[PDB]
Structure 1
Amino acid sequence: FQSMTLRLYSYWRSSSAWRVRLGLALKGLAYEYRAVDLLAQEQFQAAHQQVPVLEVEEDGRTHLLVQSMAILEWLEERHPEPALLPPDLWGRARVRALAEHVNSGTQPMQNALVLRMLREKVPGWDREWARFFIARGLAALETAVRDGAGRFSHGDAPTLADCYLVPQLYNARRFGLDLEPYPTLRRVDEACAALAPFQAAHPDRQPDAP
């Protein structure tokens, strides 16, 4: 008998990895942190045309789970409490949509490879592009979150939606975006920041934070 073990391949500043760190922390799940040298990896990838990976061992078999949303859905199914999705069908669809706004609708357009391609083609274009797409994504997210937010993105408890929102706002700040136009997002971000699991998952608390 081999009871389940968790290992996360992570980079301190990766928003994708951070989402999964939030799911793990909110669920009270311990895991081995395995740092990936993402800056070296990206330099190599650049010259030649990834995290998170959640490695799970149980009963002598190993599973390598990838894609933040798939990993988070697995955490929610495998370890139900505390719940990061609401119990009702409508609320679940809303929370998944908020998460996907970020997962598919905002973050990909500020992918390191995307920005690198833009920068190699036209220097500086990468910054303009990231700012445009992140602001666009946040404007749409602000509207959607406002219609249904309580203390958090959905009602009065953290959900998968907050796990996507928080790292995306950090990236927005990195690109120098004014967050004043997203008051609901800022309020929710502040509520999350006061929670111990959010503090634990933050880039600055990770073993590979320089």
Structure 2
Amino acid sequence: DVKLHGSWVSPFNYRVIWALKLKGVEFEHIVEDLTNKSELLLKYNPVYKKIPVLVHGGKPIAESLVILEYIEETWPENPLLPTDPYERAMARFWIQYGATKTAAFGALFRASGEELEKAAKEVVEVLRVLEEQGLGDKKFFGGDSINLVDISFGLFTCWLEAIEEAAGVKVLEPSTLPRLHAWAQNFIEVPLIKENIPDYDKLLLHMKGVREKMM
């Protein structure tokens, strides 16, 4: 009834898996080959022709951020957004902030030397804003448990850790971002996340490969 088209290393696909598993929704994972895309993926998502795509009752929903809100509205139990409109707007604001800065991270895989060290400092600054103004002193962006904001920022855990190791740069460190680093450790320790993350060695292998073609 619920099908998920996506990659086994994509952080965007994992956001959807986390949300469905937090809701207790049974789903079939359909592995999408990037070199040979199926007839379903080209008709379900004709605009971007990219993953992830959620299919519910044969109807497709693309773009992980739209998918996350569809899951929240379709399965309202175990809420992943607050009910207060101002708090919901702040959650949307931080999610959009992360989505806009998912471009400054690309410079970590293209630049080198003193140009790479400039890109790393820019990413640290983006993370510091998120830490100070978004997370604050809460355990999670969702307060005492993870919400859509934590899910949207989960890529700053093992995916960012793999990029840091592939490019030889340090960005999310305890000395510079103590609260965000403590959050990243707590996020990965949440049993739902721990049981549903890609193998680090396989993910690191992929990030090294991506860095290679991006120079």
Q: Please confirm whether the aligned pair reaches a TM-score higher than 0.5, indicating the same fold.
A: yes
The answer as to 2:176 corresponding to 1:195 is no
**Deviation digits for residues 124-165 of structure 1, max 9, x if unmatched?**
59x838645533421221122233x52211321211110012
Alignment TM-score, normalising by the size of structure 1: 0.73
Per the alignment, in what secondary structure is the counterpart of residue 8 of structure 1? strand
**Matched-pair contact (CA < 8 Å) for 1:85–1:95:** yes
Alignment gaps of 5+ in structure 2: 37-49, 165-169, 207-215
Structure-to-structure mapping, 1:151-190, within 5 angstroms: 151-176=139-164, 177-180=170-173, 181-190=176-185
Alignment TM-score, normalising by the size of structure 2: 0.72
**Matched-pair contact (CA < 8 Å) for 1:145–1:154:** no
Question: 2:53: which partner in 1?
Answer: 53
Paired residue type of 2:95: A
- CA separation of 1:186 and 1:25: change in aligned 2, threshold 3 A: farther
Aligned pairs, how many? 181
Per the alignment, in what secondary structure is the counterpart of residue 203 of structure 1? coil
How far apart are the structure 1 equivalents of 2:17 and 2:104?
22
- Shift, 1:198, TM fit: 1.0
Question: 2:3: which partner in 1?
Answer: 7
- Shift, 1:85, TM fit: 0.3
Counting aligned pairs with the same residue, the percent is 26
Paired residue type of 2:195: A
Question: 1:47: which partner in 2?
Answer: none
Instruction: Indicate the RMSD between aligned Cα atoms, in angstroms.
Output: 2.9
**Matched-pair contact (CA < 8 Å) for 1:13–1:203:** yes
Alignment gaps of 5+ in structure 1: 42-49
How far apart are the structure 1 equivalents of 2:163 and 2:126?
14
**Deviation digits for residues 88-115 of structure 1, max 9, x if unmatched?**
11211121222222222x224446xx88
Question: 1:103: which partner in 2?
Answer: 99
**Matched-pair contact (CA < 8 Å) for 1:102–1:168:** no
The answer as to 2:126 corresponding to 1:137 is yes
